[PDB]
Amino acid sequence: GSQALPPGPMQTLIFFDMEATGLPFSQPKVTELCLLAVHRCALESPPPTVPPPPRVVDKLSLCVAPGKACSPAASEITGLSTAVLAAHGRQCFDDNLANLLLAFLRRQPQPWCLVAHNGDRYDFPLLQAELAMLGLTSALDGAFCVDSITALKALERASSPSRKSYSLGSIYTRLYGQSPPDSHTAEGDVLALLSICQWRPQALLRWVDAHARPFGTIRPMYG
Amino acid sequence: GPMQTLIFFDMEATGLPFSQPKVTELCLLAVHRCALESPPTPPTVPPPPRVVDKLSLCVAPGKACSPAASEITGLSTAVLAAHGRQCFDDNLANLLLAFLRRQPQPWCLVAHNGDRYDFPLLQAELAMLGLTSALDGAFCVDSITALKALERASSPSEHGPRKSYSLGSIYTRLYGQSPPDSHTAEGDVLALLSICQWRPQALLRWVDAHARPFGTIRPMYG
Ligand SMILES: Cn1c(-c2cccc(Br)c2OCCO)nc(C(=O)Nc2cnoc2)c(O)c1=O
Ligand SMILES: Cn1c(-c2cccc(Br)c2OCCO)nc(C(=O)Nc2cnoc2)c(O)c1=O
Ligand SMILES: [Mg+2]
Ligand SMILES: [Mg+2]
Ligand SMILES: [Mg+2]
Ligand SMILES: [Mg+2]
């Protein structure tokens, strides 16, 4: 057989979050997503308390009509409800949304690595479920992905001897001694994750290069 | 009739129009009419609505930025190439249209000095790709024309030298401080959003009345 070319070093980190109508057991639907694409050089080749975002970034932030009610807890946490999303004329997760995500990713040099906090439990399998419901199961087979919880635990352990919270808020406070702005909004969470990842970016890129998984290996949450 | 989506819009470029400039950066921020008409029920500056769609992209211009452009925007052709940015291409044109198609029509692009800068340069970039018709479904308004019209209708007739309608000048007159960010396309779009949230009902009436089809904007150059 002809073997896969090793992807080599990740050229684009896409910091990624979605918010949903509820918890995975509910078979939730997407209400919000944010992608923030950073070139490797912005982390390999960059003093304030919280480092600023790189000047050169690509960002996409969209609200989505979920087509079912949000749980009360989900609405209180995210400040979104199905009724308000409908008052803002939001459209459901559709072929046009999938086209827009791929067009955005195609502006970035490959290989692409999606980086999401609790990506494996939440954002990655929900995105795969949304794409599977459109019959677009292969849409992101080109991409790599990392759960930043997995990455940051392995960095912490590697930079530790023999339990701390690994909530996005918790890690951020340990590093920076303040809460992140606009928490539990997709863009707020992506900006907080970027800030955490600019802490020891060389160590993070080494880990991402070694452990990035083809997105196609992520099974949909439901279906 | 009533615009359903206001898309606050800014591009940055390699230089001023006489230089036949190329896009280096663009930001679109789509707000539903109701976000301006009926904001949630004060701070010195109104907050942005919770429900927004946002797109912010850097573009490889294919030529050098002027020293003044680089200084004002903090971008250069060398830095954009270091970050592996792609030129203004069919994929970008498709991305912009797919973003607008998330929004209910009618669409109104709102850009500060849009008639001299952002609109004609956007039409120039689309025309050089052979995509002259791509965004002619949209309407557009130059916020300078809008704010001037509102101010004329809310002041005695002007005499002697006129005030600056720079983005910074308008922001400072209203809010008594500089915008948070004066160096990025996204910063300029958020500052314009804040300015347009000052008298949003009077602004929407004017927009509803005076919005132009984007297809009537001639390219900055051929
Ligand atoms: C805070 N929070 C929560 C969350 C945490 C605890 C309790 C609730 Br209810 C949460 O959901 C709030 C709505 O997303 N969930 C997600 C999330 O991606 N949930 C998904 C994805 N796919 O299926 C479920 C977040 O990004 C987030 O910031
Ligand atoms: C500050 N500034 C200026 C600007 C003002 C004075 C001097 C210079 Br040099 C400027 O250009 C800086 C690079 O965009 N120009 C634009 C602009 O849209 N220029 C375009 C668009 N199409 O052709 C030229 C801005 O958005 C902006 O905020
Ligand atoms: Mg999430
Ligand atoms: Mg989140
Ligand atoms: Mg501009
Ligand atoms: Mg500007």
Curated annotation (Swiss-Prot), chain B:
Keyword Transmembrane in record: no
EC number: 3.1.11.2
Cofactor binding, per record: Binds 2 Mg(2+) per subunit. The second magnesium ion interacts with only one residue. Substitution with Mn(2+) results in partial activity.
Subcellular location: Nucleus; Cytoplasm, Cytosol; Endoplasmic reticulum membrane
Keywords: Aicardi-Goutieres syndrome, Cytoplasm, Disease variant, Endoplasmic reticulum, Exonuclease, Hydrolase, Magnesium, Membrane, Metal-binding, Neurodegeneration, Nuclease, Nucleus, Phosphoprotein, Systemic lupus erythematosus, Ubl conjugation
Expression sites (tissue/organ): Detected in thymus, spleen, liver, brain, heart, small intestine and colon.
Example GO molecular function: 3'-5' exonuclease activity
Names of the cofactor(s): Mg(2+)
Ligand binding (Mg(2+) 2): 10
Effect of residue 148 to R: Reduces ubiquitination
Modified residues (Phosphoserine): 66, 155
Function: Major cellular 3'-to-5' DNA exonuclease which digests single-stranded DNA (ssDNA) and double-stranded DNA (dsDNA) with mismatched 3' termini. Prevents cell-intrinsic initiation of autoimmunity. Acts by metabolizing DNA fragments from endogenous retroelements, including L1, LTR and SINE elements. Plays a key role in degradation of DNA fragments at cytosolic micronuclei arising from genome instability: its association with the endoplasmic reticulum membrane directs TREX1 to ruptured micronuclei, leading to micronuclear DNA degradation.
Disorder this protein is connected to according to its UniProt record: Aicardi-Goutieres syndrome 1: A form of Aicardi-Goutieres syndrome, a genetically heterogeneous disease characterized by cerebral atrophy, leukoencephalopathy, intracranial calcifications, chronic cerebrospinal fluid (CSF) lymphocytosis, increased CSF alpha-interferon, and negative serologic investigations for common prenatal infection. Clinical features as thrombocytopenia, hepatosplenomegaly and elevated hepatic transaminases along with intermittent fever may erroneously suggest an infective process.
Subunit structure, as described in the record: Homodimer. Interacts (via proline-rich region) with TCERG1/CA150 (via the second WW domain). Component of the SET complex, composed of at least ANP32A, APEX1, HMGB2, NME1, SET and TREX1. Within this complex, directly interacts with SET; this interaction does not result in TREX1 inhibition. Also interacts with NME1, but only following translocation to the nucleus. Directly interacts with UBQLN1 (via ubiquitin-like domain); the interaction may control TREX1 subcellular location.
Protein name (Swiss-Prot/TrEMBL): Three-prime repair exonuclease 1
Native species: Homo sapiens (Human)
Gene: TREX1
